[model samples]
Target: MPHRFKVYNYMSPTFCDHCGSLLWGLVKQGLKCEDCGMNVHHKCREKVANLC
Candidate 1:
């Protein structure tokens, strides 16, 4: 499986599920999202199983 992560709104203030840090700014390279601000770091996403 390619794996999946929960999606969050771009305007929402949330933290990175993997690192548990504030999520701000644009999505890092290699990340994928159906919408803006709903992306994850390629490395973090790959390492973690669930994120939102």
Candidate 2:
């Protein structure tokens, strides 16, 4: 199953929920799963599990 993913900007510092990497930049930080609230890096999204 595919996650309902969308681009999100973190107001504060945050790490990738999938790869445990630091999210860089000020905007367009990463992708968030609307259904599960899973936050991951742009490239990390592909490796995230379908737990939702």
Candidate 3:
């Protein structure tokens, strides 16, 4: 189920993948995964391998 995720620039508050904390950063530094549309931190992207 690949979801068409949007960027966080104009999105509502999201959560971080690493700590499961709310992502309040408006720097667009996180990623919205394709499958689940998860808000993953840039630093955690490398660690979250094969996210589906």
Q: Looking at candidate 1, what is the lDDT of residue 3?
A: 45
Q: Each prediction's Cα lDDT score? A: 0.51, 0.87, 0.63
Q: By summed lDDT, which 10 consecutive residues of candidate 1 come out lowest?
A: 28-37
- lDDT at 9, model 2: 95
Candidate 3 deviant stretches above 4 angstroms? 1-10, 49-51
Candidate 1 lDDT, 1-52, residue by residue in tens:
2444444444555566457666665543334344333456555776765433
User: What value of lDDT does candidate 3 attain over all alpha carbons?
Assistant: 0.63
Give residue 41's lDDT in candidate 1 (0 to 100). 54
Model 3 clash number = 0
What TM-score fits each model? 0.44, 0.86, 0.58
Across residues 5-41, which tens digit of lDDT does each residue of candidate 2 receive? 8999999888989888878999999988998888899
Task: For each candidate in turn, give its C-alpha RMSD to the true structure in angstroms.
Answer: 5.8, 1.1, 3.6
Candidate 3: tens digits of C-alpha lDDT, residues 1-52 = 2333445552677777666867666678577776686677666665664636
In model 3, pairs of residues that clash are none
